[PDB]
Amino acid sequence: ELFFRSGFGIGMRKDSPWKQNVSLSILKSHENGFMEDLDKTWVRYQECD
């Protein structure tokens, strides 16, 4: 069972002008079904039972 839970994340240097809009595009993509669609095509094709 999982014993260290910490997700991924786009890394940026401190004092970066893009540090806000990058973190607001990810939140919107979760709620639009976009990141539940990339999972369908790249990570979740069953091959063996």
Partner: protein, 473 residues
Amino acid sequence: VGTSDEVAIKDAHEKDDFHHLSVVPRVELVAMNETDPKSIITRICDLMSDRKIQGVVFADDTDQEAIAQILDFISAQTLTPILGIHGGSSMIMADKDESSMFFQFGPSIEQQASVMLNIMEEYDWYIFSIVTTYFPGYQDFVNKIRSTIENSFVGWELEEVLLLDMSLDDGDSKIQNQLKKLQSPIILLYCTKEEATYIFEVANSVGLTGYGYTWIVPSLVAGDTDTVPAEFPTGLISVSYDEWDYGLPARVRDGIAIITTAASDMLSEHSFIPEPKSSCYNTHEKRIYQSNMLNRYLINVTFEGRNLSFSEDGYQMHPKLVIILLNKERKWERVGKWKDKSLQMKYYVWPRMDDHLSIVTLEEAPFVIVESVDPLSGTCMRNTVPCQKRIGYIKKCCKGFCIDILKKISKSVKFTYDLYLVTNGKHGKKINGTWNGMIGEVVMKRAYMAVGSLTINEERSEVVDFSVPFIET
């Protein structure tokens, strides 16, 4: 002794409506500057020679630190009861002689140690330290506190019960090391009026006094309501005998009725009132007329309906106490009130308060659990934190999964807080351009934080900024 009006006191002298029993109190008003023991001994023992009296009531308006002890010695050497009413005669004492039937008007030493803990529960001051000096009675102050702490479901923390043994010369070095070991928000002190100012001088040098640190002292430390030596730090809180509603003429009238209804009531049952020799001598020869029978029921008396019974040590069983607080203007101000194991504090929330922030929460079944306050003690229990609630506020207890995060975070980032449940909406929503709920208060600068079961999304992130998630949803 002191500055007073004779006619004002004498107006209520013959005012006791004691027509039920023929006491006939021949009250005599005596005024004399008798601070020194010589004047007392040459007057008390001469009164019986002139006027046949078997009862003396003493009052004073001086801050003498040993007048009660020297006045008690006359009671031990005689069989005439005497009561201390006002001034230094009402100061506390450790013990009395078995033959010294002298009593006072004032709270005992155990009760004062039981009122300090009765105001810390309301304001949730669960960590404290004790500083005590040598005095006849300082042993009971520590013991009474420990007994109450042991048997209680509330979370009491004790530390630095070190005492100041300031008796040797050049004690500044010794006091500084002892005083530097105090690291508690509130410190309880037990000293004398003169001894207090010595310790307070060292306190300001260290820097302990100020905001974040509070001191509580008993009645005798304050002493006077108008003589402020300007050494007491602002915010000092003390519990003292009521004096605004307990006037000097009223004290005399109340005291006189106690003695009159005691000796006369003995004639009702014993039917033989002793007549001791009215002189300073021949006390041993008059040992036949023992006053043990009189002493049996002189303490247990009643006047118009009340309990004025004294303890065996000579302390009033049901006294009246008030809580006073010093201000910037160096004038004592009334804050609290005590009457028959009841407390009525004027201030619902202590005015004194970046390190102090507000917190808004909300009840959710596995995360934030709200339970009612303990009925037995009227204060929140252990492992839970107090949390207010509107509708006049009501104090609940809050505990759960999210609260443990808040307590653990505040330990490392070292900041304080005070939660309170929201009452307008829940969880946040936007209606016609207005936010209501846990988010509708952060946006209006009434919270500055909000811990609970909030959900991150784009609509809310453009108004407030969230932290790193600690759970998935």
